Tab-separated table of C-alpha atoms in Angstrom:
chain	number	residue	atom	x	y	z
A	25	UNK	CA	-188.030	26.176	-99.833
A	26	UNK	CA	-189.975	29.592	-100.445
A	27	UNK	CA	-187.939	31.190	-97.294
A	28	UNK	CA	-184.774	30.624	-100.097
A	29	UNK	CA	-186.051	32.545	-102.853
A	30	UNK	CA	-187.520	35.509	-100.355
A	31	UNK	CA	-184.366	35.470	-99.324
A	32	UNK	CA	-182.646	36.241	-102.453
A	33	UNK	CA	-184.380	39.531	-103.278
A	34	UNK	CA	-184.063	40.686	-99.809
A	35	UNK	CA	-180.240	40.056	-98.971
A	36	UNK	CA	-177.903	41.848	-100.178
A	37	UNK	CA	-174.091	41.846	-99.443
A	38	UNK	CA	-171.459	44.176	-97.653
A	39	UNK	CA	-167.842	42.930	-97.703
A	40	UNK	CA	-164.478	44.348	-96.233
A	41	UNK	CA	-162.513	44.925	-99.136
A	42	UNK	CA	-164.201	41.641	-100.893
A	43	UNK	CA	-164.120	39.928	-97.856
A	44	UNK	CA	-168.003	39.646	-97.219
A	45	UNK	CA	-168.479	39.979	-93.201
A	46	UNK	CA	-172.345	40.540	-93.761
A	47	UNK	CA	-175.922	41.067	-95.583
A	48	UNK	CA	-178.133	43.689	-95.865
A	49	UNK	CA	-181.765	42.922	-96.292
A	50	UNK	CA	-184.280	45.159	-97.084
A	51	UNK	CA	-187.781	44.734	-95.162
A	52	UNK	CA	-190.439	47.252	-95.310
A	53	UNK	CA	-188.262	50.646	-96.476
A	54	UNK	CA	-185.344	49.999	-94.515
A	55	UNK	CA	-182.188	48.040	-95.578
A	56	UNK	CA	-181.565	46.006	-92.465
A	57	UNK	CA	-177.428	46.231	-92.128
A	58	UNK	CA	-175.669	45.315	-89.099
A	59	UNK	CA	-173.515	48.344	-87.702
A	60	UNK	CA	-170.682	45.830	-86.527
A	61	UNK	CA	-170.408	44.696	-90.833
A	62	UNK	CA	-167.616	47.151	-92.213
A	63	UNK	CA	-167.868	47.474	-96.105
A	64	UNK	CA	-169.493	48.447	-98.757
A	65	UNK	CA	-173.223	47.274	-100.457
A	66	UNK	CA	-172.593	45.375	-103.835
A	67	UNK	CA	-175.700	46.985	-105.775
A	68	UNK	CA	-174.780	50.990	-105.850
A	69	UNK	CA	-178.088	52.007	-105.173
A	70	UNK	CA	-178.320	51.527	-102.460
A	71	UNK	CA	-174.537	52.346	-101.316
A	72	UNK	CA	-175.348	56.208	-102.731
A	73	UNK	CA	-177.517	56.712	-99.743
A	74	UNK	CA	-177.070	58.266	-96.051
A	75	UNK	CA	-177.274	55.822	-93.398
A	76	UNK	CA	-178.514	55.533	-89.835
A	77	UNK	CA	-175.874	54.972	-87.336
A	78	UNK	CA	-176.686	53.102	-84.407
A	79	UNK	CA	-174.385	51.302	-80.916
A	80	UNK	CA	-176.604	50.288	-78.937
A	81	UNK	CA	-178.806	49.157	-80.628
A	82	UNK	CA	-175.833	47.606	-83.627
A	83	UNK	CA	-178.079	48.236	-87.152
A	84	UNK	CA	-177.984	50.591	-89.985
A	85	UNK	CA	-180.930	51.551	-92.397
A	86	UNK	CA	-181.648	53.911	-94.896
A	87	UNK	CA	-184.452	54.423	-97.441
A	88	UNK	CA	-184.451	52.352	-100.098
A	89	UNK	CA	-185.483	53.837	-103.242
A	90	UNK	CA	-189.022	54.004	-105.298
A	91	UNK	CA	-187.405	50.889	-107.421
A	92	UNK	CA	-186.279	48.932	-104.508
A	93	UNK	CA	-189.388	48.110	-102.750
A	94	UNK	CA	-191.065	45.493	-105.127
A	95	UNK	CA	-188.055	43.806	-104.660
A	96	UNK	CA	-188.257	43.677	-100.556
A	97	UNK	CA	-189.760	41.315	-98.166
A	98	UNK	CA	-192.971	41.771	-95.887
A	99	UNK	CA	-192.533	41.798	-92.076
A	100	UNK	CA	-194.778	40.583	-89.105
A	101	UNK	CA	-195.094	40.649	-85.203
A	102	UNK	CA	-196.208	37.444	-84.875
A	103	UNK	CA	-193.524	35.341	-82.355
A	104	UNK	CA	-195.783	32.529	-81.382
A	105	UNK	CA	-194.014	29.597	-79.274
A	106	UNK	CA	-192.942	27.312	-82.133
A	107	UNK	CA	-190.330	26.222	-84.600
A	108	UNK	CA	-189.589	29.315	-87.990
A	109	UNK	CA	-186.937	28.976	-90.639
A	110	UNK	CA	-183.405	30.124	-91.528
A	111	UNK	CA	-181.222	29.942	-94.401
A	112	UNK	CA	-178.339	27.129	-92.659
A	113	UNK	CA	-181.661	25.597	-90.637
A	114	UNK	CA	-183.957	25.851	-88.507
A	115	UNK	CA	-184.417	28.378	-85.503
A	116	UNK	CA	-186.662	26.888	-82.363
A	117	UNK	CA	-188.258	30.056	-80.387
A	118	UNK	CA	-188.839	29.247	-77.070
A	119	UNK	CA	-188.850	31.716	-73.937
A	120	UNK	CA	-187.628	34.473	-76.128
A	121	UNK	CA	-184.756	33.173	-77.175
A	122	UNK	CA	-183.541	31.951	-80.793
A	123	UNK	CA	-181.389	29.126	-80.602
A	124	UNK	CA	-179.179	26.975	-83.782
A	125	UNK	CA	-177.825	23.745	-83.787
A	126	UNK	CA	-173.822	24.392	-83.097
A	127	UNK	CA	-172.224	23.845	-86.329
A	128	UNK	CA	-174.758	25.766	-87.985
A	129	UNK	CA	-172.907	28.839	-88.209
A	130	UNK	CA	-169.112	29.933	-88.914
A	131	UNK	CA	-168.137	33.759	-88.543
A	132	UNK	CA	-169.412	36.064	-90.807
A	133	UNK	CA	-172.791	35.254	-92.145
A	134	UNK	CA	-174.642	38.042	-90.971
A	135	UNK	CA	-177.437	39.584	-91.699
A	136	UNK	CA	-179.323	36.857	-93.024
A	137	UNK	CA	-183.340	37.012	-92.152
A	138	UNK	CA	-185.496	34.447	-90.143
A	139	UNK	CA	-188.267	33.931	-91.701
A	140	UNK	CA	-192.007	31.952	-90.051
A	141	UNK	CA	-193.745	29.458	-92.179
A	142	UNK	CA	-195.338	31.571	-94.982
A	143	UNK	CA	-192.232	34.063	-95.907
A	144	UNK	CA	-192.769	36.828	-93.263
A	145	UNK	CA	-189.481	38.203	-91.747
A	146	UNK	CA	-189.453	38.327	-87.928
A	147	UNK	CA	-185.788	38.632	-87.120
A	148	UNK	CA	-182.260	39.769	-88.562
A	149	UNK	CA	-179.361	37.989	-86.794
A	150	UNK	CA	-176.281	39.496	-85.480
A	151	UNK	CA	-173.864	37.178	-83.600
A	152	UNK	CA	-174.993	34.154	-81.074
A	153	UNK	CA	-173.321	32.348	-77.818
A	154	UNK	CA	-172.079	28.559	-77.805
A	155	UNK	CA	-175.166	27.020	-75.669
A	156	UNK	CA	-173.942	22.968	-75.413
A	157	UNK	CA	-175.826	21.372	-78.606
A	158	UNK	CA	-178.327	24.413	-78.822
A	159	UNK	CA	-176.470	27.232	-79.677
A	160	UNK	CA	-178.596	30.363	-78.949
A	161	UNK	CA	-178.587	33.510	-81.553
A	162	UNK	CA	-178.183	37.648	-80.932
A	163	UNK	CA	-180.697	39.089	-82.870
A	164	UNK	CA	-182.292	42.611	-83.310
A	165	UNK	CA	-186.456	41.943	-82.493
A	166	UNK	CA	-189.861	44.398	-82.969
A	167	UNK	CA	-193.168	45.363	-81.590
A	168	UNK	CA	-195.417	47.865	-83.074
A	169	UNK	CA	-193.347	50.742	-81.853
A	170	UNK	CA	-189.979	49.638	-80.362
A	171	UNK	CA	-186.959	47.378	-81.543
A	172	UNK	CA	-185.329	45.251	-78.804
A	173	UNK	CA	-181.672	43.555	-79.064
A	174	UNK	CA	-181.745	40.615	-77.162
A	175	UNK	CA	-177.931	39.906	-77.109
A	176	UNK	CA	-177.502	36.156	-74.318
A	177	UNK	CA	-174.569	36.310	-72.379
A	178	UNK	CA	-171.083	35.059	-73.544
A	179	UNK	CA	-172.314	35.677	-76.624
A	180	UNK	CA	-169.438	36.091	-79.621
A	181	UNK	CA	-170.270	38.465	-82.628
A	182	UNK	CA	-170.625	35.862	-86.177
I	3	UNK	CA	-190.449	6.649	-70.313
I	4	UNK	CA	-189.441	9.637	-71.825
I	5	UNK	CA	-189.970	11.021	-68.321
I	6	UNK	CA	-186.692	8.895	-67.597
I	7	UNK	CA	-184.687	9.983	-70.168
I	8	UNK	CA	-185.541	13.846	-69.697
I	9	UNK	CA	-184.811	13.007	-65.540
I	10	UNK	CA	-181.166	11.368	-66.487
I	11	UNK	CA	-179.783	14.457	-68.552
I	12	UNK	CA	-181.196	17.274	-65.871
I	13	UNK	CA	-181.079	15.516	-62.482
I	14	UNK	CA	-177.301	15.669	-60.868
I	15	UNK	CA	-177.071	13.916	-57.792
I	16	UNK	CA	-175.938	15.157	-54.289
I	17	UNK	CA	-173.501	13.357	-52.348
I	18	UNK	CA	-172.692	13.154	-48.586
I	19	UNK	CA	-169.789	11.242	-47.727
I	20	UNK	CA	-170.531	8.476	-49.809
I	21	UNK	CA	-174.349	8.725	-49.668
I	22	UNK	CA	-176.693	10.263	-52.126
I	23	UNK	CA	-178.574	12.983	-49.878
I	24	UNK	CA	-180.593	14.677	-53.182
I	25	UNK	CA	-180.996	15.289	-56.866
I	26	UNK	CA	-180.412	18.625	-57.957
I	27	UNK	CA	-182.138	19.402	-61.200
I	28	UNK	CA	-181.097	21.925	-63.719
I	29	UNK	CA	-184.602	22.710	-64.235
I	30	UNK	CA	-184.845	26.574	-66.399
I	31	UNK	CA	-181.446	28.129	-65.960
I	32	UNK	CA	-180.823	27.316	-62.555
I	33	UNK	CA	-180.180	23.967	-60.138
I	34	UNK	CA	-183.376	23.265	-57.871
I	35	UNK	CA	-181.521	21.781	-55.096
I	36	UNK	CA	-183.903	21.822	-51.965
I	37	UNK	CA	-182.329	23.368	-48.497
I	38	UNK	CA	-182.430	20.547	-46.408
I	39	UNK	CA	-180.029	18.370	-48.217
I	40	UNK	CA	-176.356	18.544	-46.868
I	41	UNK	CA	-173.939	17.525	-49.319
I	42	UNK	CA	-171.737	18.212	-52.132
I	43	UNK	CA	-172.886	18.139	-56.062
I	44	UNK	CA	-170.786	15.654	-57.969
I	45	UNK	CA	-170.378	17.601	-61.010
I	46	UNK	CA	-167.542	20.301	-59.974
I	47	UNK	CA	-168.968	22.994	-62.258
I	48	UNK	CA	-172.114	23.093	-60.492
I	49	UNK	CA	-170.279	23.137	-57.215
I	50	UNK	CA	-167.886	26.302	-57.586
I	51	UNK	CA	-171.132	28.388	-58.176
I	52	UNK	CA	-172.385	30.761	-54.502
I	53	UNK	CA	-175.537	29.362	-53.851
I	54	UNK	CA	-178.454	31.612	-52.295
I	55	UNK	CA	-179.893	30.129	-48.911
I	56	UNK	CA	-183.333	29.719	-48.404
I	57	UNK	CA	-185.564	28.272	-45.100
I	58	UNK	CA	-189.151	28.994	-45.660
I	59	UNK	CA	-189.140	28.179	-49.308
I	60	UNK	CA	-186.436	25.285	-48.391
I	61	UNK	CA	-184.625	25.539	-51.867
I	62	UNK	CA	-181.125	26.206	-53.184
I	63	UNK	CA	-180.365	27.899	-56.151
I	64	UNK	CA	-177.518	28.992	-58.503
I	65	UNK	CA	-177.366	30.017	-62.137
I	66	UNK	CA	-176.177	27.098	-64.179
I	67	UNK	CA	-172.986	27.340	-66.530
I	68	UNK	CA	-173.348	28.477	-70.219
I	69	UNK	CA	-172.948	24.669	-71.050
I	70	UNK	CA	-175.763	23.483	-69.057
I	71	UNK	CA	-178.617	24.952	-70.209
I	72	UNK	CA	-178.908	22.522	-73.330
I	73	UNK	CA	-178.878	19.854	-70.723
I	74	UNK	CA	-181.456	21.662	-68.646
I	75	UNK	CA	-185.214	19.927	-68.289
I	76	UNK	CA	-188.154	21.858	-69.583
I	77	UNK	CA	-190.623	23.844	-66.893
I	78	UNK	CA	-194.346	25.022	-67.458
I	79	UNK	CA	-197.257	26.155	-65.374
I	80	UNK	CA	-200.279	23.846	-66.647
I	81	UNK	CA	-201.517	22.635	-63.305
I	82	UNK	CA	-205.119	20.848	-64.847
I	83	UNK	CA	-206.718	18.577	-62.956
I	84	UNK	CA	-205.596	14.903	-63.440
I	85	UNK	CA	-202.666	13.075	-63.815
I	86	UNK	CA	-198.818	13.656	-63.816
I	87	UNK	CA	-195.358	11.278	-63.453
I	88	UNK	CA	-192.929	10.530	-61.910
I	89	UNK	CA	-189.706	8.548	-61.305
I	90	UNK	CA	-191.153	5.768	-58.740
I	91	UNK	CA	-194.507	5.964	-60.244
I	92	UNK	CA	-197.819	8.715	-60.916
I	93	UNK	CA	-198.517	11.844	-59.246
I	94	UNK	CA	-202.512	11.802	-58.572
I	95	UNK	CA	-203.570	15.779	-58.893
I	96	UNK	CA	-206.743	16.856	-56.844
I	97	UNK	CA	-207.455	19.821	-54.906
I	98	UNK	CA	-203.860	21.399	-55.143
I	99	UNK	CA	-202.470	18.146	-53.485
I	100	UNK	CA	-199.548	15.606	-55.183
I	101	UNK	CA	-200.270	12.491	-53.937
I	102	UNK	CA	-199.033	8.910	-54.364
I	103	UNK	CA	-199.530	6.103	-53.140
I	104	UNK	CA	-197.760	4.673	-49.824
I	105	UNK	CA	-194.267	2.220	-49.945
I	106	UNK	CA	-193.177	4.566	-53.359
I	107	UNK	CA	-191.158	6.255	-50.937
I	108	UNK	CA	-188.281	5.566	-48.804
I	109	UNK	CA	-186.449	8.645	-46.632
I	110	UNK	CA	-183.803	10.561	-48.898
I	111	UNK	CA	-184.835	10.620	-53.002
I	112	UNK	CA	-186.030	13.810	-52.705
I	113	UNK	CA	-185.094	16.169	-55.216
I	114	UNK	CA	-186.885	14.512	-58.333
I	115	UNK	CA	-188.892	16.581	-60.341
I	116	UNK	CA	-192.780	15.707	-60.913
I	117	UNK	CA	-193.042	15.236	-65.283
I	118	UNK	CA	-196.846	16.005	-67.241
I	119	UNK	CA	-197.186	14.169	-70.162
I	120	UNK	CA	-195.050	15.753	-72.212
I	121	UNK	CA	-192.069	16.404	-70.754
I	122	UNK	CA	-192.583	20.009	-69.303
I	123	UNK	CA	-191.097	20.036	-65.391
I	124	UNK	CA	-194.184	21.244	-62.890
I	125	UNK	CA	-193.347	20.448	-59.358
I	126	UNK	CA	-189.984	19.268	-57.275
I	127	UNK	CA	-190.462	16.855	-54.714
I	128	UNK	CA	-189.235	17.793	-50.932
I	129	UNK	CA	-191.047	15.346	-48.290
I	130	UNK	CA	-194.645	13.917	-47.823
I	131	UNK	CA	-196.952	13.196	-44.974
I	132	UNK	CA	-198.394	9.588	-45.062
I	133	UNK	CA	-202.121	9.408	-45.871
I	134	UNK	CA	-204.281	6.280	-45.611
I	135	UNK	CA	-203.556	4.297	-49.240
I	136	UNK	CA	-202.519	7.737	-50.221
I	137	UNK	CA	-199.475	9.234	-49.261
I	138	UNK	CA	-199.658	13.270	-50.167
I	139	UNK	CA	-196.138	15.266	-51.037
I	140	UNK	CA	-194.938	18.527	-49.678
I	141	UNK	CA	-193.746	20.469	-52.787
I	142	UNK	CA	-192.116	23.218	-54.431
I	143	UNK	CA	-194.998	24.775	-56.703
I	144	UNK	CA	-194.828	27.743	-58.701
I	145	UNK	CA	-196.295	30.299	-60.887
I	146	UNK	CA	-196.180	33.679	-63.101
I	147	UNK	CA	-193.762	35.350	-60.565
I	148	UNK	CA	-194.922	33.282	-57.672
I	149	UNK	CA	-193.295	29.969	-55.913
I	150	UNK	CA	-195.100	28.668	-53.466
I	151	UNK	CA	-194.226	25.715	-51.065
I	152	UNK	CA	-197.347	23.258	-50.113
I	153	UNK	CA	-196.130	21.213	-46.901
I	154	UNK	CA	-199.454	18.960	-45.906
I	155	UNK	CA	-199.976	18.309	-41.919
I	156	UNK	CA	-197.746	16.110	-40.265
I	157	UNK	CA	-194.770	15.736	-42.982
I	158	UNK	CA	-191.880	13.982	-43.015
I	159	UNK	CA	-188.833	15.428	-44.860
I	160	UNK	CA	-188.003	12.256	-47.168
């Protein structure tokens, strides 16, 4: 239940007009935003910056300031073959892939960290397809110098 | 027997004219169905898919539906030396040969994948050449990037 309370410093909220269609989490220095969420961060601070846009590779970022990193989450590299955490679940890595119980998630809910067994972040989810009972998830992943989006096929944007 | 249950969800069978010619098996993303089988998949979804044709491997191939993959079998590469299972009974492992032991098999019921202990898919049956007590198998086997077919001397496709 530690993942919960990591989770509440990092997320943050961006909502169309009220409607929330994402979160923002802030990991390192960057505030991990999805480009595909339309709206506007709850907590100014962090809505008074410049962001990053990126298509391809569907995330926005920008610095968070001197006050806002106390207040972040630590990251990691580590995607050994096992079972991490989520906010609605559970995620179980295996062959690369993240993959949810269907039923897990409605649309919206974006944004929203997975996090391994002692708090560090290792993903920041973006949509997932309808796999049978083991729905699989589109998420943006790291190295030491590169991000990949691993986005499965069929795959519809939540 | 959780070898069965794991062989009832990913084996499909193929039918000829009213006779069971093969099991296909869903194993990864794909349906191992071998070459030599002539027949027609129950399951419709599995057989509006364009197969690739093989001879020298003697396998069949498509890429499974978005549905089945949650009903595919697990695969793995841990070939140790000792003992596996299987549907009819144990797969003895020794000097890169599956053997079992003679009356386990009749001609057709090939197409069964070979089980470890745990559940992970490592070999899919084709024939076998009659040995002594000790019947061997002609398999599919398979690696990193590698699949490689062992067919003993003498064989009989069963």
């Amino acid at each position: 239940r530690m993942c919960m309370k990591i989770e509440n410093d990092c997320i943050f909220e961006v909502k169309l007009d009220g409607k929330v269609t994402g979160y923002a989490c802030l990991v390192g220095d960057k505030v991990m935003k999805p480009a595909h969420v339309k709206g506007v961060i709850d907590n100014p601070d962090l809505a008074k910056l410049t962001y990053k846009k990126s298509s391809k590779y569907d995330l926005e970022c920008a610095q968070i300031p001197v006050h806002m990193k106390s207040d972040a989450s630590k990251y990691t590299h580590e995607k050994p073959e096992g079972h991490y955490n989520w906010h609605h679940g559970a995620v179980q890595y295996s062959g690369g892939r993240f993959t949810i119980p269907t039923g897990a998630g409605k649309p919206g809910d974006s944004g929203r960290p997975i996090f391994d067994n002692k708090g560090r972040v290792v993903a920041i989810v973006l949509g997932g397809a309808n796999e049978g009972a083991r729905t699989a998830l589109s998420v943006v992943t790291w190295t030491k110098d590169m991000v990949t989006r691993y986005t499965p096929e069929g795959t519809e944007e939540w």
